[PDB]
Curated annotation (Swiss-Prot), chains A, B, C, D, E, F, G, H, I, J:
Residues of the site described as Susceptible to oxidation: M35
Protein name: Amyloid-beta protein 40
Compartments in which it is found: Cell surface
Effect of A21G: In AD1; Flemish mutation; increases the solubility of processed amyloid-beta peptides and increases the stability of peptide oligomers
Name of encoding gene: APP
Residues annotated as glycosylated: Y10
Site feature Cleavage, where: D1, A2, D7, S8, K16, L17, F19, F20
Region named Interaction with PSEN1: 24-40
Full protein: residues contained: 672 to 711 of 770
């Protein structure tokens, strides 16, 4: 319901070689998965 | 409803590389999984 | 609703590499798994 | 009351590599597992 | 009032590699497991 | 032709789904690897 | 050296899922490192 | 000692899921590692 | 002493789940490590 | 007499689940280690 009202939080403050999934407010009741990798 | 116009703050940072998921408020009953690997 | 009239704060930061599931408030009746590996 | 006003805390500042599941407040009737491996 | 006092602070950090699965303050009725291995 | 001759080896043969990197005869020199995950 | 266009083998298959990396008898510098995971 | 001209073949047969990695010959000055995990 | 059979041979195979990490035939000055876990 | 030979020239397997990590043939100036764990 409430989400576009204000920022429930924050992430990231300037960096290199970084990735993520920013999802807040209300999650969904199901299934989720993710994978990542890097060399050197 | 679950989070009124309150404060709450979050920030992410790192050096080389970083990744993940960000979910605040109230999670639901489901399933989640993640994996990561690197070779140097 | 949990997280009654409050603020709460959290921050994450590492060097080499870091990953995880950043979630504030409280856990729920579900399942979660994570795995990571690196070669030096 | 569970938590309090102002920043509740923080996690992850500096270190080689780290991963896991972060959840404040109180844990619920669920299950969690994680594993990591590295070769020198 | 619960864990120790009102406002507080928390941060995660160490060496080599570290991982955990749980909530700060206190734990509840649940289950968790962790394993790690490496070769010198 | 050190790569044909008779039947070097064999196994199972035929499947529902498969993925990887087939490298025979010759290969590269350095470092190789990555990370992958699948559900169900 | 017996590596340039040498022999490897055969295999892989069944009726589910398979993943990995196979290279002819040619083990060079840092090679073959990573991690993988899957859930049912 | 090594595979001095004497045939060479390898085959892998699994069922549910299988993963692996390695050089079919001689492990020279290098390093290799792998990790895998699965949950019901 | 070092391989001694027609059709060379083969390696890797199982049912439920299996993992292997190591150079075939012979090995030299190197290092290898692997770890795996499952819950069910 | 060669060490526990099961890789090259043969087949690698077991029951339910199995894993292995080490140099097969002759243990020279090298090091290898592996670990695994599982729960109900």
């Amino acid at each position: 319901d409430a989400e576009f009202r204000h920022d429930s939080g924050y992430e990231v403050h300037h960096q290199k070689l970084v990735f993520f999934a920013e999802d807040v407010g209300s999650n969904k009741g199901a299934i989720i998965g993710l994978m990542v990798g890097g060399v050197v």
